[PDB]
Symmetry: C3
Subunit: 90 residues, 3 copies
């Protein structure tokens, strides 16, 4: 029942995103330099990891959400969260 | 009872920090290019994530320590660990 | 029994590595811009974290694999995975 988190950051301000898996739901809190706020990410899962990279000033984020033995990748590329092509055999 | 870790690194040497949550306590091991040693970070929690960024040559670290459903952010900005402004409703 | 993941990425394409701890075994899935494939990393553990850094164009990866209270570091420096010098007292 205890929460599990993952975190990523970019830039120098910086921007931070913290993902929390709690009771089967993953949610997102965001910092862009002045106050924490709730992000758009809402996906099911009991376990989360994240990585991100910049292309110029454009951030790209990949969140790996797992339920049971099944991992789904979620992608932020500037215009909403979409399901990514990641697969694994678990 | 099994330990859970989080890791971050910066630079090219590199510097590495590995955080271990074990039996409700989070501790830190450090590498700055020649030998592992114990860091100053000691905070309670059963779950840990971390992110870091450089501003010039100055490292900034954020550790997200969770106990139950409560997440506390700890901040390294060059002069000791301090509690950060992160909040979430879990 | 549920899987736990860790992820790292580098570059702008980017390269991504996702490590999955499942039933005591850690495995690796890789993206280098066009298709996911299975990486060379295979090590025991119930918990995984990862960090990576570039020296020029050369990637270096450290995977922290934990079983029980024992953490082993695995190193990629361009020519196969090797056990690293990390130790901790847990
Ligand atoms: O500014 C917040 C936001 O747009 O940042 C990018 C992603 O983290 C989104 O989920 C999030 O809502
Ligand atoms: O050189 C070690 C150290 O000062 O590095 C910065 C932080 O990781 C501290 O907790 C740690 O003790
Ligand atoms: O191209 C894939 C690969 O060589 O990339 C570097 C490491 O992630 C290896 O485990 C992996 O097999």
């Amino acid at each position: 029942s205890s929460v599990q988190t993952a975190a990523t950051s970019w830039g120098t301000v910086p921007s931070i995103r913290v993902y929390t898996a709690n009771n089967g739901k993953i949610t997102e809190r965001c910092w862009n330099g002045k106050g924490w706020y709730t992000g758009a990410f809402n996906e099911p899962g009991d376990n989360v990891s994240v990585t991100s990279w910049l292309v110029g000033s454009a951030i790209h984020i990949r969140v790996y959400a797992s339920t049971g033995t099944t991992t789904t990748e979620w992608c932020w590329d500037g215009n909403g969260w979409t399901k990514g092509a990641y697969t694994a055999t678990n």
